Each structure stands twice: as C-alpha cells, then as structure tokens.
Design a protein around this ligand. Sequence first.
Ligand SMILES: *C(=O)c1cccc(C)c1
Ligand SMILES: [Ca+2]
Length: 240
Amino acid sequence: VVGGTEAQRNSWPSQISLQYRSGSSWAHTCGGTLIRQNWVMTAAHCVDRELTFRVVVGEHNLNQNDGTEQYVGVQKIVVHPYWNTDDVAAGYDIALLRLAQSVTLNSYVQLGVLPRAGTILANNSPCYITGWGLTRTNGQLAQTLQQAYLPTVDYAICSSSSYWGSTVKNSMVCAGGDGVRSGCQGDSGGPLHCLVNGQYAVHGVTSFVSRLGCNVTRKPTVFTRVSAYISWINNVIASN
Ligand SMILES: *C(=O)c1cccc(C)c1
Ligand SMILES: [Ca+2]
C-alpha cells in the first residue's frame, strides 16, 4: 500500500497474509480474506506458481511476534475455472483456499463479511485497501499492516479512455487513482473494505495496478468485484 497509514491491530481481523516457503523461511506474497474458519478468498494470480503456501491469521507485523498469529497450511486451491494467467484484464481473478485446520476466532481473527450478490457501490464510496504490499512503486513490503482510503471509481468513469478503458470490466471494482494512495505488489488478493449501511464489507479482491506504477493518477487500483462471485464462492464451499 502506497500512501497508507499503519492499521490498528484489531481493525481488519479478516485480513490474512498468504506466504510461500523459500528455503528454510516463509515469504509474504499476497493478501487474502478469511471467509470461513477453514476458507480464505484471494486472487487467482497469487496461486499461479506451483509453490508451498501457508496462511497467517492474526498477523500485524510480518517481521515480529505479535502474540496473536495462527499459522495454517493450505490443503486445497480452487481457482475460478475461467481464470487465465495470460489475461488478468479478462477478470475471474479469484481463488478459494481450503485451510488444513480451522482457525480460532477472536478480536484479531474474524470472518470477512461479503456483500449481497449484485451489489454495486455508488461512485466515490468510502473504502480502505489493506495489506503489507510495497510502500512505493519498486519499493519494499511493509512490516506492519497498512491501510489507505481509496474511494470507488464507478465503471463508467473507470472504463473511460483517460482511466483504464476496456481493460476494466463490470466484474471489477476500481478505487483510488489520486496519484498518492494505491495498492501495490504484495497487496494482491487482499480486501477492499467498504462502509455500507454502517458496516464494513469486503467488496474487492485486489487484482492489479498499472504497469507504469502503483500510485498513478487516473489508474485506480483494480479489484475483483466480490458481489459478482457470491454464487461461485457458495458453490465451491458447498462442494469441498
Ligand atoms: C498485486 O500484488 C499486484 C500488483 C500489480 C499488478 C498485479 C497483476 C498484481
Ligand atoms: Ca507477526
């Protein structure tokens, strides 16, 4: 997250760190949202590589003991069947991870609330992106979980020629684009939390930013629109 602030450690208890094994260590690669005690929602592109993955819930500082973490293996990966790694602009950037154990819930570990199917946010709706991704274009991961206020940019604006054009689909949410605040590498897969009727819900799964840079004016961060995938998510959980 470029232009973020440090989250409070109990603000976003559905945020997870998706990590892969590197030698004798683990490296953060992506975010995700805990949606059942044994299921995480992330981006398909985050699990394209044939790596060993684990999820960390209750994580605040990637580099320090928080006293709240639970570490759990990934047992099954279900990518959306229309996902194509060569075509992130086509959409379907969503995957479900079945965890090897069910995590324990507390103030640091909670299920993410998803929107009702079909819900579309008004232009300029208040949202926060969260993650441990790079804090500058071509920079380095955050140590502590970051948040940035990224108001939505509706499909009509986001898909206009001065923004993303035909690269954005109605199956996506755009947010931000102010040139200061954005998602960045390492935030992919994580949530966009939007305040609706007094409650935060996870409306987006971070999918991409511009090849030119993270915080680029009129290139808002692009997310998979969770409300387009409610039936798919329910069908996967019910069949696994
Ligand atoms: C997320 O980590 C991410 C950043 C830039 C581009 C892509 C496709 C994903
Ligand atoms: Ca930690």
